């Protein structure tokens, strides 16, 4: 009994692959005219979801790729954050560490603070990965530090989707990462990692799953009813 499909995708298939857009459009469209509901997962901000999905994608709704924030037909029907006191600890703890992190505002680039704009280019100064991080992962870092990193004086005030952590040296974000669970009731955050360089941090219990679960109950569709597609 699939009454929904929910198309679990990294933004990046669709921002570069125009023909990956194309099919994924005409996809959604062929299963909407099948009846079924179709949700996307996508994106880490409420700005993000707007690049990456263009309005002739026919979904019935769509979530950030991590659960904090859903739209239906224009409509945002929940959004979880971390308040800013939130990302000043996490930030500050990082920053005792000297772990490279990035924090993503629901709206505008990820920010950083400049003041650690210096430690974290001299970590990704290797024109190749090193000590066994992946490609795409040291990729990325290279380029959010050309141009994607907004560099601020202090976080401006709102709330943000997400805050993520890097280190090259594997025992400190290990152990780093050990740290923010053993104390993510006190600090009311979720924990999750991509690899084993990484640490991501949102609000508390909310991530994909959640998002996915507020969605779906958004159309009265039970999770027995819903095939999640992409992981």
Same mark, same amino acid.
Request: negative net charge.
């Given at each position: 009994?699939?009454?929904?499909?929910?198309? &679990?995708? &990294?933004?990046?298939?669709?921002?570069?692959?125009?023909?990956?857009?194309?099919?994924?459009?005409?996809?959604?469209?062929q299963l909407r005219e099948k009846g079924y509901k179709v949700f996307?997962?996508?994106?880490? $901000?409420? /700005?993000?979801?707007?690049?990456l999905v263009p309005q002739d994608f026919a979904v019935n709704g769509?979530?950030?790729?991590?659960?904090?924030?859903?739209?239906?037909?224009?409509?945002?029907?929940?959004?979880h954050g971390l308040s800013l006191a939130q990302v000043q600890q996490?930030?500050?703890?990082?920053?005792?560490?000297?772990?490279?992190?990035?924090?993503?505002?629901?709206?505008?680039?990820?920010? $950083?603070?400049?003041?650690? !704009?210096?430690?974290?280019?001299?970590?990704?100064?290797?024109?190749?990965?090193?000590?066994?991080? %992946?490609? /795409?992962?040291? $990729? $990325?870092?290279? &380029?959010?530090?050309?141009? @994607?990193? #907004?560099?601020?004086? @202090?976080?401006?005030?709102?709330?943000? %989707?997400?805050?993520? =952590?890097? /280190?090259?040296? =594997?025992?400190?974000?290990?152990?780093?990462? #050990?740290?923010?669970?053993?104390?993510?009731?006190?600090?009311?955050? /979720?924990?999750?990692?991509?690899?084993?360089?990484?640490? !991501?941090?949102?609000?508390?219990?909310?991530? @994909?799953?959640?998002?996915?679960?507020?969605?779906?109950?958004?159309?009265?569709?039970?999770?027995?009813?819903?095939?999640?597609?992409? &992981?």
């Open positions: 009994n699939v009454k929904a499909i929910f198309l &679990d995708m &990294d933004g990046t298939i669709l921002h570069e692959n125009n023909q990956a857009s194309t099919y994924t459009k005409d996809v959604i469209n996307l997962a996508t994106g880490r $901000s409420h /700005s993000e979801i707007h690049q769509i979530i950030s790729s991590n659960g904090t924030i859903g739209e239906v037909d224009g409509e945002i029907i929940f959004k996490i930030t500050n703890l990082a920053k005792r560490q000297q772990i490279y992190y990035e924090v993503f505002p629901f709206e505008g680039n990820r920010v $950083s603070l400049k003041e650690d !704009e210096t430690w974290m280019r001299d970590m990704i100064r290797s024109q190749d990965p090193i000590n066994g991080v %992946s490609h /795409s992962e040291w $990729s $990325s870092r290279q &380029d959010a530090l050309a141009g @994607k990193i #907004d560099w601020v004086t @202090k976080f401006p005030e709102g709330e943000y %989707s997400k805050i993520y =952590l890097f /280190s090259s040296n =594997l025992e400190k974000i290990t152990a780093f990462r #050990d740290e923010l669970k053993q104390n993510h009731v006190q600090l009311q955050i /979720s924990v999750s990692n991509s690899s084993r360089f990484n640490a !991501e941090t949102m609000a508390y219990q909310t991530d @994909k799953g959640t998002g996915i679960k507020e969605m779906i109950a958004h159309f009265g569709i039970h999770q027995e009813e819903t095939l999640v597609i992409g &992981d």
